[PDB]
Design a protein around this ligand. Structure first.
Ligand SMILES: COc1ccc(S(=O)(=O)N2CC3(COC3)C2)cc1NC(=O)c1[nH]c(C)c2c1CCCCC2=O
Length: 127
Protein backbone atom coordinates (compact mmCIF):
# COMPACT_ATOMS: atom_id res chain seq x y z
CA UNK A 1 0.00 0.00 0.00
CA UNK A 2 1.13 3.47 -1.02
CA UNK A 3 1.45 6.57 1.09
CA UNK A 4 -1.35 9.07 0.63
CA UNK A 5 -0.35 12.39 -0.87
CA UNK A 6 0.87 14.64 1.94
CA UNK A 7 -1.41 17.43 3.19
CA UNK A 8 -1.61 20.47 0.97
CA UNK A 9 0.67 23.37 1.89
CA UNK A 10 -0.48 25.98 -0.65
CA UNK A 11 -3.73 27.22 -2.17
CA UNK A 12 -3.98 30.04 -4.75
CA UNK A 13 -7.54 30.92 -3.71
CA UNK A 14 -6.92 31.24 0.01
CA UNK A 15 -6.37 34.77 1.38
CA UNK A 16 -3.10 35.37 3.19
CA UNK A 17 -1.88 37.58 6.01
CA UNK A 18 0.92 38.05 8.50
CA UNK A 19 0.08 38.44 12.20
CA UNK A 20 2.02 38.44 15.43
CA UNK A 21 0.29 35.20 16.44
CA UNK A 22 1.47 33.51 13.24
CA UNK A 23 4.99 34.86 13.80
CA UNK A 24 4.90 33.35 17.28
CA UNK A 25 3.60 30.02 15.98
CA UNK A 26 6.42 29.67 13.44
CA UNK A 27 9.34 31.31 15.21
CA UNK A 28 8.64 30.31 18.82
CA UNK A 29 6.23 27.34 19.00
CA UNK A 30 7.26 25.35 15.93
CA UNK A 31 10.91 26.31 16.36
CA UNK A 32 10.99 25.09 19.97
CA UNK A 33 9.60 21.67 19.05
CA UNK A 34 11.55 21.42 15.78
CA UNK A 35 14.92 21.69 17.52
CA UNK A 36 13.91 19.36 20.37
CA UNK A 37 15.72 16.07 20.96
CA UNK A 38 12.47 14.19 20.24
CA UNK A 39 11.42 16.04 17.07
CA UNK A 40 12.58 13.59 14.44
CA UNK A 41 9.56 11.17 14.29
CA UNK A 42 7.37 14.23 13.79
CA UNK A 43 9.38 16.26 11.26
CA UNK A 44 7.73 14.69 8.19
CA UNK A 45 4.71 12.59 7.19
CA UNK A 46 4.91 8.97 8.32
CA UNK A 47 6.36 7.13 5.32
CA UNK A 48 4.41 3.89 5.70
CA UNK A 49 6.11 2.43 2.63
CA UNK A 50 9.73 2.88 3.70
CA UNK A 51 8.85 1.97 7.31
CA UNK A 52 6.67 -0.98 6.19
CA UNK A 53 3.64 0.08 8.25
CA UNK A 54 0.74 -0.86 5.92
CA UNK A 55 -1.85 -0.34 8.66
CA UNK A 56 -0.86 3.24 9.54
CA UNK A 57 -3.15 4.96 7.02
CA UNK A 58 -5.86 2.39 7.65
CA UNK A 59 -6.01 3.77 11.20
CA UNK A 60 -4.91 7.39 10.69
CA UNK A 61 -7.24 9.18 8.28
CA UNK A 62 -6.23 12.76 9.23
CA UNK A 63 -2.42 12.62 9.09
CA UNK A 64 -0.41 15.63 10.21
CA UNK A 65 3.23 16.32 11.06
CA UNK A 66 5.49 19.23 11.93
CA UNK A 67 7.11 19.31 8.49
CA UNK A 68 3.69 20.03 7.00
CA UNK A 69 2.92 22.58 9.73
CA UNK A 70 6.27 24.32 9.12
CA UNK A 71 5.66 24.47 5.36
CA UNK A 72 2.13 25.74 5.93
CA UNK A 73 3.42 28.59 8.10
CA UNK A 74 6.25 29.35 5.67
CA UNK A 75 3.76 29.47 2.76
CA UNK A 76 1.26 31.61 4.71
CA UNK A 77 -1.33 28.82 4.49
CA UNK A 78 -2.86 29.70 7.87
CA UNK A 79 -5.02 32.79 8.40
CA UNK A 80 -5.99 32.02 12.02
CA UNK A 81 -3.73 30.80 14.81
CA UNK A 82 -6.54 28.31 15.58
CA UNK A 83 -5.89 26.54 12.28
CA UNK A 84 -2.24 25.92 13.14
CA UNK A 85 -3.02 24.86 16.70
CA UNK A 86 -5.57 22.39 15.32
CA UNK A 87 -2.88 20.81 13.14
CA UNK A 88 -0.52 20.38 16.11
CA UNK A 89 -3.39 18.83 18.08
CA UNK A 90 -4.12 16.43 15.23
CA UNK A 91 -0.47 15.35 15.03
CA UNK A 92 -0.42 14.48 18.72
CA UNK A 93 -3.82 12.77 18.64
CA UNK A 94 -2.70 10.48 15.80
CA UNK A 95 0.34 9.41 17.80
CA UNK A 96 -1.81 8.48 20.80
CA UNK A 97 -4.29 6.60 18.57
CA UNK A 98 -1.73 4.43 16.80
CA UNK A 99 0.76 3.79 19.63
CA UNK A 100 0.45 2.28 23.09
CA UNK A 101 1.52 3.16 26.64
CA UNK A 102 5.12 2.09 27.04
CA UNK A 103 6.04 2.89 23.45
CA UNK A 104 9.01 5.23 23.24
CA UNK A 105 7.19 7.45 20.73
CA UNK A 106 4.34 8.06 23.19
CA UNK A 107 6.70 9.48 25.79
CA UNK A 108 8.35 11.55 23.04
CA UNK A 109 4.96 12.92 22.00
CA UNK A 110 4.02 13.68 25.62
CA UNK A 111 7.25 15.62 26.17
CA UNK A 112 6.71 17.58 22.95
CA UNK A 113 3.05 18.22 23.76
CA UNK A 114 3.97 19.54 27.21
CA UNK A 115 6.33 22.03 25.57
CA UNK A 116 3.70 22.88 22.94
CA UNK A 117 1.20 23.67 25.69
CA UNK A 118 3.70 25.80 27.61
CA UNK A 119 4.42 27.84 24.48
CA UNK A 120 0.83 28.11 23.20
CA UNK A 121 -0.29 29.36 26.62
CA UNK A 122 1.91 32.43 25.95
CA UNK A 123 0.41 33.15 22.51
CA UNK A 124 0.48 36.97 22.17
CA UNK A 125 -2.68 39.05 22.06
CA UNK A 126 -4.80 39.16 18.90
CA UNK A 127 -4.98 42.18 16.61
C1 LIG B 1 10.78 3.02 13.03
O1 LIG B 1 10.31 4.35 12.78
C2 LIG B 1 11.19 5.23 12.22
C3 LIG B 1 12.51 4.95 11.91
C4 LIG B 1 13.33 5.95 11.41
C5 LIG B 1 12.81 7.22 11.22
S1 LIG B 1 13.80 8.45 10.43
O2 LIG B 1 13.32 9.74 10.81
O3 LIG B 1 15.17 8.11 10.61
N1 LIG B 1 13.47 8.26 8.86
C6 LIG B 1 12.44 8.80 7.93
C7 LIG B 1 12.66 7.56 7.04
C8 LIG B 1 12.72 7.70 5.51
O4 LIG B 1 11.49 6.95 5.34
C9 LIG B 1 11.53 6.56 6.74
C10 LIG B 1 13.93 7.26 7.86
C11 LIG B 1 11.49 7.51 11.53
C12 LIG B 1 10.67 6.51 12.02
N2 LIG B 1 9.32 6.69 12.36
C13 LIG B 1 8.63 7.85 12.44
O5 LIG B 1 9.03 8.92 11.99
C14 LIG B 1 7.28 7.75 13.01
N3 LIG B 1 6.60 8.91 13.27
C15 LIG B 1 5.37 8.64 13.80
C16 LIG B 1 4.48 9.75 14.26
C17 LIG B 1 5.23 7.25 13.85
C18 LIG B 1 6.44 6.68 13.34
C19 LIG B 1 6.59 5.19 13.16
C20 LIG B 1 6.25 4.38 14.41
C21 LIG B 1 4.76 4.18 14.66
C22 LIG B 1 3.82 5.13 13.92
C23 LIG B 1 4.03 6.56 14.33
O6 LIG B 1 3.20 7.14 15.03
Amino acid sequence: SMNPPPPETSNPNKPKRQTNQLQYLLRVVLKTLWKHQFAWPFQQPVDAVKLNLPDYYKIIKTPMDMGTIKKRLENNYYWNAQECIQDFNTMFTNCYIYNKPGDDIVLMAEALEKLFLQKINELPTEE
